[PDB]
Coordinates of C-alpha atoms and ligand atoms in Angstrom, one line a residue:
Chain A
X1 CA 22.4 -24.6 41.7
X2 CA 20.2 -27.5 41.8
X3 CA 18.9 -26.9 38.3
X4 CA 22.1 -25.2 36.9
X5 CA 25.1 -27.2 38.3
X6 CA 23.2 -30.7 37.3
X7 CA 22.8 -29.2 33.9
X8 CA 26.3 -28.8 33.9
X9 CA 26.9 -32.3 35.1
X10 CA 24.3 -34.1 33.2
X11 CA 26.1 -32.3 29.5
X12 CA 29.5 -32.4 30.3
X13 CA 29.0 -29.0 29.3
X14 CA 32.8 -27.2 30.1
X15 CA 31.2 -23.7 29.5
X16 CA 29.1 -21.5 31.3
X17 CA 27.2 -18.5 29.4
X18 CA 26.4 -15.5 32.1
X19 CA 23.6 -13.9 30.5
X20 CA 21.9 -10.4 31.7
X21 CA 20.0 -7.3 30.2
X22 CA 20.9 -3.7 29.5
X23 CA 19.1 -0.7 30.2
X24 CA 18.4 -0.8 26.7
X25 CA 16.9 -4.8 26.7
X26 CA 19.7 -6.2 24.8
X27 CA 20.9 -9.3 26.1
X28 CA 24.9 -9.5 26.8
X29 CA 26.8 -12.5 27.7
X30 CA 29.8 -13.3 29.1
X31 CA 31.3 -17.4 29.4
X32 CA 33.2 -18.9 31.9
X33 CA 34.4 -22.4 32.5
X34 CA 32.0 -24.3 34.6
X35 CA 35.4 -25.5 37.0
X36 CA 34.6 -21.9 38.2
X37 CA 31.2 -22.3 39.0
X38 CA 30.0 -23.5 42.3
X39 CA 26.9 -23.8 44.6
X40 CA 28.5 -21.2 46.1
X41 CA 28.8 -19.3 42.8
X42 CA 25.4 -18.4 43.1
X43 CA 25.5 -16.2 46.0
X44 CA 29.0 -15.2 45.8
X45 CA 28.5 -14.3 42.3
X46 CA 31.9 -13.3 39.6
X47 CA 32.6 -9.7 38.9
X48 CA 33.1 -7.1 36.4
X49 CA 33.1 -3.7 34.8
X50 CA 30.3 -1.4 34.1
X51 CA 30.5 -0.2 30.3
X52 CA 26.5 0.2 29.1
X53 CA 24.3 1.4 31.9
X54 CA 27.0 3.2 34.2
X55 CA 30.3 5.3 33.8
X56 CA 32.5 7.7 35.6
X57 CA 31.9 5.1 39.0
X58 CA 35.0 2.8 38.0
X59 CA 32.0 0.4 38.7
X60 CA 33.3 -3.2 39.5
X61 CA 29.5 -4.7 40.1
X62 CA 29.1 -8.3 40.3
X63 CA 27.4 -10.6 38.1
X64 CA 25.0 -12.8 40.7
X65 CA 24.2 -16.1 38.7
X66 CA 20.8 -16.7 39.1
X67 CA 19.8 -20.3 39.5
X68 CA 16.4 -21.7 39.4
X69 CA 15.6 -22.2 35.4
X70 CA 16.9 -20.2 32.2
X71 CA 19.6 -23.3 32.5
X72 CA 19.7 -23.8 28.9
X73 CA 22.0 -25.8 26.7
X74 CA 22.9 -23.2 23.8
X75 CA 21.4 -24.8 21.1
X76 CA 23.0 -23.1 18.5
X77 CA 26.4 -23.4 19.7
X78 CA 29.0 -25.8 19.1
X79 CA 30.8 -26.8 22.3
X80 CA 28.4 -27.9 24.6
X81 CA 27.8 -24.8 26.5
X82 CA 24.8 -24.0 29.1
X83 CA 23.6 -20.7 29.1
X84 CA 22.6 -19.0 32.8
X85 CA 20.0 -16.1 31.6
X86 CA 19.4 -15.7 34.9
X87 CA 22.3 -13.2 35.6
X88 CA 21.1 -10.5 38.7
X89 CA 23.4 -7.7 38.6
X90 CA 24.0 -6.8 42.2
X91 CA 26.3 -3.8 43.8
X92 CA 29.7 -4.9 45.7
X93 CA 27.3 -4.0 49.1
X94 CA 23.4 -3.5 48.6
X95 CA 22.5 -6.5 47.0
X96 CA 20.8 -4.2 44.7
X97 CA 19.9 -3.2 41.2
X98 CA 23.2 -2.8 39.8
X99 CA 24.7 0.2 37.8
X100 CA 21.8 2.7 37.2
X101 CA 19.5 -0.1 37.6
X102 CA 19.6 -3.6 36.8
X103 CA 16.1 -4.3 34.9
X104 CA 15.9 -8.3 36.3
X105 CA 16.0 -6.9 39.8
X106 CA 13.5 -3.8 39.4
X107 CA 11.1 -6.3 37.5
X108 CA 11.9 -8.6 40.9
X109 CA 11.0 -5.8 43.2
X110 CA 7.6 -5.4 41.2
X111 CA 7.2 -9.1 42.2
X112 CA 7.7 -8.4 45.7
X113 CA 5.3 -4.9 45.4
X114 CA 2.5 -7.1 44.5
X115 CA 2.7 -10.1 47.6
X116 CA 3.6 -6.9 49.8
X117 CA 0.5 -4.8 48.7
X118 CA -1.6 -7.8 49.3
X119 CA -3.1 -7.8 46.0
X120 CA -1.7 -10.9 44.2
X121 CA 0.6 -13.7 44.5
X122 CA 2.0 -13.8 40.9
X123 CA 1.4 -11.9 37.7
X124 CA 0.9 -13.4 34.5
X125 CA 2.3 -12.0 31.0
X126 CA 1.9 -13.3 27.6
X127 CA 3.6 -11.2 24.9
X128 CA 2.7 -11.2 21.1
X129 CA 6.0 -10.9 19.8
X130 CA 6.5 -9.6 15.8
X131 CA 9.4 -10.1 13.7
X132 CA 10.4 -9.6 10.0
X133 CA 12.8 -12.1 8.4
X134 CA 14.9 -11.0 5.5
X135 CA 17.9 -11.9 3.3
X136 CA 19.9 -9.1 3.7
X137 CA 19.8 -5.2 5.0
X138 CA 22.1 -2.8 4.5
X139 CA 22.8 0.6 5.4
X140 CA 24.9 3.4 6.1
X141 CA 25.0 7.2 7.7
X142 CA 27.9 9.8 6.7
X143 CA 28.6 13.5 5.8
X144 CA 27.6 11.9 2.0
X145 CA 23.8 11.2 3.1
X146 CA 21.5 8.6 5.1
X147 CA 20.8 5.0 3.3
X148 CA 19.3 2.0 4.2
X149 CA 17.4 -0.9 1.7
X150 CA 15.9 -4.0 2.7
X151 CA 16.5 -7.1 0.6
X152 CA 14.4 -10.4 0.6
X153 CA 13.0 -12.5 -2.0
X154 CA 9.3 -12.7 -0.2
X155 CA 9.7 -9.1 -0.5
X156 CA 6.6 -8.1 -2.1
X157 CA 8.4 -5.7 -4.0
X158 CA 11.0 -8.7 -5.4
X159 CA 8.8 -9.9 -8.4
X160 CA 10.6 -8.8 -11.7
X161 CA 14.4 -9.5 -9.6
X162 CA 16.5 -11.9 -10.7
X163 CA 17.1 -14.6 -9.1
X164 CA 19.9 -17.7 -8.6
X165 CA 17.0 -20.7 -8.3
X166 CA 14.9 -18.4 -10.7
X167 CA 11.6 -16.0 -9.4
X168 CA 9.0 -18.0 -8.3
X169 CA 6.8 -15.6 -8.5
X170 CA 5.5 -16.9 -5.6
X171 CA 5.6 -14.5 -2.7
X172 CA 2.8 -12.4 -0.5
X173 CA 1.4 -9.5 -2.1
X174 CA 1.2 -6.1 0.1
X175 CA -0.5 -6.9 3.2
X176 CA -1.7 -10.0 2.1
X177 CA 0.6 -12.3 3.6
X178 CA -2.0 -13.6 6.3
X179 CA -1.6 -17.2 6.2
X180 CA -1.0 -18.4 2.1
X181 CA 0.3 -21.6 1.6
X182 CA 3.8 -22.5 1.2
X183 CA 4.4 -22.0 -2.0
X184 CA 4.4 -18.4 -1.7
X185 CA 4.6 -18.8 2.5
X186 CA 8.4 -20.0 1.9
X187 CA 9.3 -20.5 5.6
X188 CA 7.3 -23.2 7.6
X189 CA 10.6 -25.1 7.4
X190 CA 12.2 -22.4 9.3
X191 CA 9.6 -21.5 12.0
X192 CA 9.4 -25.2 12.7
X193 CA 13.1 -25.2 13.2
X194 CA 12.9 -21.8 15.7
X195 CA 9.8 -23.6 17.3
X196 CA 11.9 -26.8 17.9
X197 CA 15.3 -24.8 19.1
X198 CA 12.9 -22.6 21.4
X199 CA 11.6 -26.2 23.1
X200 CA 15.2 -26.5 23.2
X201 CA 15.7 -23.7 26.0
X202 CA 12.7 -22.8 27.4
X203 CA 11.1 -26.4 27.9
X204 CA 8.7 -29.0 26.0
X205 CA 5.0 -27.5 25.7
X206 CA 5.7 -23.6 25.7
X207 CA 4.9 -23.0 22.1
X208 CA 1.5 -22.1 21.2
X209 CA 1.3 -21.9 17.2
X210 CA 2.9 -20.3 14.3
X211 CA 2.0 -18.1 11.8
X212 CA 3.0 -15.8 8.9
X213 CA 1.9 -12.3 10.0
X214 CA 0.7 -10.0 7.8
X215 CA 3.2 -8.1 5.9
X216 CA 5.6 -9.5 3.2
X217 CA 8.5 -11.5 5.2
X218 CA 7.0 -10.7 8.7
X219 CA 6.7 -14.0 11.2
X220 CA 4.8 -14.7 14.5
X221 CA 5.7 -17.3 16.6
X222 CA 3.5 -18.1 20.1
X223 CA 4.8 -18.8 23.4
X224 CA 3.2 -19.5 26.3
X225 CA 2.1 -17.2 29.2
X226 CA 4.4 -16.6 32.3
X227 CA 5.3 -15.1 35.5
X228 CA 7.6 -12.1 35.0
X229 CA 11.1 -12.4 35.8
X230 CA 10.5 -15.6 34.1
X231 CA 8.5 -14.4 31.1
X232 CA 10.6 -11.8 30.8
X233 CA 13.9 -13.9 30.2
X234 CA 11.9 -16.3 27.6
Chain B
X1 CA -6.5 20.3 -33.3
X2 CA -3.7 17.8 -35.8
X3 CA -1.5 20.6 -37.0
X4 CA -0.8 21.3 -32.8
X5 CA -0.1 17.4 -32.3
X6 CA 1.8 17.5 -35.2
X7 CA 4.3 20.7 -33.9
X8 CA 4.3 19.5 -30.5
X9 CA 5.5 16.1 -31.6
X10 CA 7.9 17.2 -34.0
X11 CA 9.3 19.7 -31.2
X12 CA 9.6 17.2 -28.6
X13 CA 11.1 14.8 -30.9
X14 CA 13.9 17.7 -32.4
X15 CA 14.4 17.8 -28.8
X16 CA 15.8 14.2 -28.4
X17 CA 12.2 13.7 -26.8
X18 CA 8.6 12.1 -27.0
X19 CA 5.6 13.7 -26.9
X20 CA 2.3 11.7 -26.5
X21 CA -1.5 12.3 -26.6
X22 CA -2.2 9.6 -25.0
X23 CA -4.9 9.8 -22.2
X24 CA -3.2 7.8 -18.9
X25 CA -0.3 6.9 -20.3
X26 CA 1.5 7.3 -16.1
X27 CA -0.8 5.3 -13.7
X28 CA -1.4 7.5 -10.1
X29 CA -0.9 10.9 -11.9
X30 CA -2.8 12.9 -13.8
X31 CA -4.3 11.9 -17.1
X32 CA -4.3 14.0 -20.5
X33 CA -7.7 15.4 -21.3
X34 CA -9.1 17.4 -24.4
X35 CA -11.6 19.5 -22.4
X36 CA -14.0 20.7 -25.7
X37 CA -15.4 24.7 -25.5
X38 CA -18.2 25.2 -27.9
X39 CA -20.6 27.9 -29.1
X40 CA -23.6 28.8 -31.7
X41 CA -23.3 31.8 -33.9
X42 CA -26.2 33.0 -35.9
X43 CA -25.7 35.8 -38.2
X44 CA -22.6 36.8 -36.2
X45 CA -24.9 36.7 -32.4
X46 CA -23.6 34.4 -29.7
X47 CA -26.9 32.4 -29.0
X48 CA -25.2 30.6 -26.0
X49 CA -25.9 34.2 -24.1
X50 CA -29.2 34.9 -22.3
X51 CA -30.1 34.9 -18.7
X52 CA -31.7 31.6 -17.6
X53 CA -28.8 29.8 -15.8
X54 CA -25.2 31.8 -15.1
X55 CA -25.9 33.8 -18.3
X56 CA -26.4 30.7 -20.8
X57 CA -30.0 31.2 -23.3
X58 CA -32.3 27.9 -23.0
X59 CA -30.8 27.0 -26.1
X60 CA -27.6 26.2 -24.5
X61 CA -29.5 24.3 -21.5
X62 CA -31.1 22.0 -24.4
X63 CA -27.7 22.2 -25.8
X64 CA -26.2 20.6 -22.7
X65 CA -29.6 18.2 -22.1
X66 CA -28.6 16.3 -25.3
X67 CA -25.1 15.9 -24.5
X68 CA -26.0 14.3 -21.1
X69 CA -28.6 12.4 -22.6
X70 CA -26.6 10.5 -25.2
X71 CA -23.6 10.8 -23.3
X72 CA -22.5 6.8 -22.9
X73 CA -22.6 7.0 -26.5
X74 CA -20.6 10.0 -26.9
X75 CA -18.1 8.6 -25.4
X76 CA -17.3 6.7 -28.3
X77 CA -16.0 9.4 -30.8
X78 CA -14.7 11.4 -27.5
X79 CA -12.8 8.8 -25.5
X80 CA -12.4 6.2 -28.1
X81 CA -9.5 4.7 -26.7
X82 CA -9.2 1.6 -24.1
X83 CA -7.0 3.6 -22.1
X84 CA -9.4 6.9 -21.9
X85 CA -11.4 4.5 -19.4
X86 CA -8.0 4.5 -17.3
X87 CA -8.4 8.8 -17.2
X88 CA -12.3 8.4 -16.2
X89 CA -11.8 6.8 -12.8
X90 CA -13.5 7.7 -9.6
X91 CA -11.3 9.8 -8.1
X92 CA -10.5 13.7 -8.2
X93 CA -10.4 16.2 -11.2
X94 CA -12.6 13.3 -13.0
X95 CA -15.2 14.4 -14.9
X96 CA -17.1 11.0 -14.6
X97 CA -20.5 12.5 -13.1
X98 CA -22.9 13.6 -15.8
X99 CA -24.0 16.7 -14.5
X100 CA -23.1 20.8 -15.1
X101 CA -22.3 23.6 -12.8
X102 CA -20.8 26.5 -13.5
X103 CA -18.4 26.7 -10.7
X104 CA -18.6 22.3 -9.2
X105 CA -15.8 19.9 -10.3
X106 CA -16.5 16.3 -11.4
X107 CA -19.0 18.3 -13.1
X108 CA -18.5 16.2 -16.8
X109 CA -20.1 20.0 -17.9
X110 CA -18.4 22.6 -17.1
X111 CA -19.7 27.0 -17.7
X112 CA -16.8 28.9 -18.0
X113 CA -16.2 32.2 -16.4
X114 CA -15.9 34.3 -19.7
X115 CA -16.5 37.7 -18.1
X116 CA -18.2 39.2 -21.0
X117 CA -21.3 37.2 -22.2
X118 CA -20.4 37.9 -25.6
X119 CA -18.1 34.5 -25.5
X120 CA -20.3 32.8 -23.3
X121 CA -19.5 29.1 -23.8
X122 CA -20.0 25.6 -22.8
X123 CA -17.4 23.3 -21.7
X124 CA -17.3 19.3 -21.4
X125 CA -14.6 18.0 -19.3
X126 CA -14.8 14.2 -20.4
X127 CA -13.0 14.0 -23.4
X128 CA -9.6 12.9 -23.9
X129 CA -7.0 13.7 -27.2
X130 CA -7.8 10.4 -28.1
X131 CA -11.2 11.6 -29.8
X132 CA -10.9 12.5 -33.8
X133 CA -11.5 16.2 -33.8
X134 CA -13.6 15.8 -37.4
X135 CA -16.1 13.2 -35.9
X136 CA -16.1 14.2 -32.1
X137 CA -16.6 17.8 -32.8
X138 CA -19.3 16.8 -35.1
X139 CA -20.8 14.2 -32.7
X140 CA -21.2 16.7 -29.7
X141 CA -23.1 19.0 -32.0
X142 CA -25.7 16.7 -33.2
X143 CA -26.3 15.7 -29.9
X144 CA -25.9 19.2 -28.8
X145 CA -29.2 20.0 -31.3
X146 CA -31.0 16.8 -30.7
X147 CA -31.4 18.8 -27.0
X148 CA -31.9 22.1 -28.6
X149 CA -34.7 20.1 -31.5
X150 CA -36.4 18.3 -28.9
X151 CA -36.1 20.9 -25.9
X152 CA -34.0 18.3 -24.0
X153 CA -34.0 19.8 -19.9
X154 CA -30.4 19.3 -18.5
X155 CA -32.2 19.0 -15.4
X156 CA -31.1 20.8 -12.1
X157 CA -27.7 21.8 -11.7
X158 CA -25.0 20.5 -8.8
X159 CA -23.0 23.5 -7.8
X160 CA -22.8 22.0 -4.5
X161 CA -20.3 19.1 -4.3
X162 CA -18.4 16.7 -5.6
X163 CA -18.9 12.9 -4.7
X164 CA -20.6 12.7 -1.2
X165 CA -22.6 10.0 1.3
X166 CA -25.2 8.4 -0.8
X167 CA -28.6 9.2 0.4
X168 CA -29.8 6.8 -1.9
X169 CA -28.6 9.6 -4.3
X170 CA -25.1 10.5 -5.7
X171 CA -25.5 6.8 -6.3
X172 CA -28.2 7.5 -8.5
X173 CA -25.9 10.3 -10.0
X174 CA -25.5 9.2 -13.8
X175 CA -21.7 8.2 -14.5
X176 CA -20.1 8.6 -18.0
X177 CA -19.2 5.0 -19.8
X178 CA -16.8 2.2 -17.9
X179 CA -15.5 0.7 -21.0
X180 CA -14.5 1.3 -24.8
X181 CA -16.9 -1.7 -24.5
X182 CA -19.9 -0.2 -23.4
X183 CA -19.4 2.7 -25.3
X184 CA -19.6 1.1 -27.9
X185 CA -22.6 -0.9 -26.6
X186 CA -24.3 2.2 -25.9
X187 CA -23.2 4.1 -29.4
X188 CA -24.7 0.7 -31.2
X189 CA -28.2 2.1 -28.8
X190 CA -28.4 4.9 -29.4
X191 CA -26.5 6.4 -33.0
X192 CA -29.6 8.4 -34.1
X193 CA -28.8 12.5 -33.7
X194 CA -25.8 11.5 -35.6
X195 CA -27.7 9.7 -39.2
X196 CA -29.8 12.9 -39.3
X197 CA -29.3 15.2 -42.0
X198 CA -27.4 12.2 -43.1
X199 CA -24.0 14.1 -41.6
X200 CA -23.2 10.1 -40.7
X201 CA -23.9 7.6 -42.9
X202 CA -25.1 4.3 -41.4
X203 CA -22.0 2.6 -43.2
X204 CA -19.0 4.9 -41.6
X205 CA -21.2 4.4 -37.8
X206 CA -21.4 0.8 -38.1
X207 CA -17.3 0.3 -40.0
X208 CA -16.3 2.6 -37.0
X209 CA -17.5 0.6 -34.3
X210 CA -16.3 -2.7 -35.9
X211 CA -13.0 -0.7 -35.9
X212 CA -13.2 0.4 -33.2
X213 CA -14.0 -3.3 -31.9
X214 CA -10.6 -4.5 -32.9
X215 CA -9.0 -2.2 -30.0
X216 CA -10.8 -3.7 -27.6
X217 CA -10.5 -6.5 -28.6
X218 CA -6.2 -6.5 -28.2
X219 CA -7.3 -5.1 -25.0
X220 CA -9.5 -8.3 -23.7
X221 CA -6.9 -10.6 -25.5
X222 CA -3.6 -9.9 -23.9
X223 CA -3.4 -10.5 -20.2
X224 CA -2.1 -7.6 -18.2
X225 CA 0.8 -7.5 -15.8
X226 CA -1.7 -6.7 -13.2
X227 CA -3.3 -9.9 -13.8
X228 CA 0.1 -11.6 -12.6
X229 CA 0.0 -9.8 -9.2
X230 CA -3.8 -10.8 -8.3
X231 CA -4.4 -14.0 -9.3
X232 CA -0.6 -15.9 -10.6
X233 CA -0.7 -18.0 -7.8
X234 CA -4.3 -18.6 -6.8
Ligands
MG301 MG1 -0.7 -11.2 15.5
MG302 MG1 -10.8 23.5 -18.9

């Protein structure tokens, strides 16, 4: 791959990381040494077993390493390692959606279904993604009962805990965590380092603006607006 | 009225317990109130009895007039504590409207269902224990005949709801006293049913509220935990 294989080159990187999506839309990886990986790689493809979205089919699908972009250096890391996101899941025969149905390619046939129906060229997507940032959580499910606690020191509920450093006493109040300064905001720091490992693997530009979302501990990060099958994998 | 605190806290306290009279002592539950019945009896005849409003003579209507009327001040002697303004909150079973109705809630004046009229009574919801039975007693029935004297109309009563859209009205609604503060404010106003027939000397009325004074002032002195959540780090 033009992009991929140069990567390699270029970081002397002696590990591959094949990355796809389960039915479910969590990411699974798989690493190889990049000796194994060849041009030729990319159609050929390596293979595997199907343990997530199929069973009972003995299913030996093969992993197609997709190419163009999603060549990332892991950041995170040690060994230099490039990461191949763009992992099609194709059928021994059928070039197809793998197991039940690999989500890249059904996502890739909606690309097609668009050209085809003489609609649109491309489709653009730009998600809003929400997360929370905590310390810790903990829980557990038995015979006994059903548990589960949440544990952060912007927590609004964490004034009157004890702390290490000491309480600042500093932290969002319910709901009103939309944009305080840092004293109470107590992350900045570590958005600007997700921002800057983001640029990382997706490219320079890409990131639009961060913010601290509303709740107590809860974090919005901008990206950019894509195509699918590219938008998708950032 | 103190022989019953006195049992109850003795009980409670044989009982490895503690009992308290205190009006709003849990925040987001339901306060302790001292709802007060009353009556007039002349040569053994229940004058509260006739047939203008839900079987109550006019003398009770003036009865209940005078009440309304000096009703801010009332609440001095009758809610005499800081935290009896935490029990008179707008919110549900609060008797914070001045009004009466036999059969309405929020009504601060309530008719009780007695069946037979010969204990027909009157009923005001407002106070809390906090209010010295001698002088709160005492206080509602001054006022009480200040209505009766002066043929004080307890205007129209609200059977029909509660707290509603304003249509410019309900707004208007007259609201029992915010504060110990402007209880005493208004007690300072308006303190004279009370001197007549000299049954309150101007000394006790004036010691009282400097007393009383000393209360609220603790109360404006000490900063509240609460403060700490709203404004610590503004
Ligand atoms: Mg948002
Ligand atoms: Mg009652």
């Amino acid at each position: 791959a033009n992009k991929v294989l140069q990567l390699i080159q270029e970081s002397g990187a002696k590990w591959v990381d094949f990355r796809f999506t389960d039915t479910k839309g969590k990411e699974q990886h798989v690493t190889y040494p990049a000796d194994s990986i060849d041009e030729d790689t990319f159609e050929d493809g390596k293979m595997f077993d199907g343990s997530s979205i199929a069973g009972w089919k003995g299913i030996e699908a093969s992993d197609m390493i997709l190419r163009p972009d999603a060549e990332t250096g892991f950041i995170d890391p040690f060994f230099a390692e490039p990461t191949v996101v763009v992992t099609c899941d194709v059928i021994e025969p059928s070039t197809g959606q793998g197991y039940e149905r690999d989500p890249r390619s059904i996502a890739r046939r909606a690309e097609e279904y668009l050209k085809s129906t003489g609609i649109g060229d491309t489709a653009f997507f730009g998600p809003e993604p929400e997360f929370f940032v905590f310390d810790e959580v903990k829980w557990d499910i038995d015979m006994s009962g059903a548990r589960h606690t949440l544990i952060a020191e912007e927590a609004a509920w964490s004034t009157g805990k004890d702390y290490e450093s000491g309480n600042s006493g500093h932290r969002p109040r319910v709901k009103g965590g939309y944009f305080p300064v840092p004293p109470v905001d107590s992350a900045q720091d570590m958005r600007a380092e997700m921002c800057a490992k983001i640029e990382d693997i997706m490219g320079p530009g890409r990131v639009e603006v961060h913010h601290h979302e509303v709740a107590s501990c809860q974090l919005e990060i901008g990206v950019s607006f894509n195509t699918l099958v590219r938008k998708a994998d950032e | 009225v103190q022989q019953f605190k006195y049992a109850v806290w003795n009980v409670a306290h044989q009982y490895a317990k503690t009992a308290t009279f205190m009006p709003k002592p849990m925040v987001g539950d339901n306060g302790s109130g001292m709802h007060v019945h009353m009556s007039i009896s002349k040569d053994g005849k229940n004058l509260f009895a006739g047939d203008e409003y839900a079987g109550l003579s006019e003398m009770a209507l003036y009865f209940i007039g005078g009440i309304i009327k000096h009703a801010r001040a009332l609440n001095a002697i009758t809610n005499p504590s800081t935290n009896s303004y935490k029990r008179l909150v707008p919110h549900f079973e609060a008797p914070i409207m001045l009004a009466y109705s036999a059969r309405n809630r929020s009504a601060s004046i309530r008719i009780p269902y007695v069946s037979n009229p010969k204990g027909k009574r009157i009923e005001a919801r407002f106070p809390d224990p906090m209010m010295n039975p001698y002088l709160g007693f005492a206080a509602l029935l001054m006022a009480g005949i200040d209505g009766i004297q002066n043929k004080i109309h307890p205007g129209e009563a609200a059977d029909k709801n509660l707290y509603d859209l304003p249509p410019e009205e309900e707004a208007k609604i007259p609201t029992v006293a915010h504060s110990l503060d402007m209880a005493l404010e208004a007690l300072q106003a308006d303190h004279e049913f009370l001197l007549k027939g000299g049954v309150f000397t101007k000394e006790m009325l004036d010691a009282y509220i400097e007393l009383k004074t000393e209360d609220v002032r603790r109360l404006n002195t000490t900063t509240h935990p609460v403060e700490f959540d709203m404004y610590y780090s503004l």
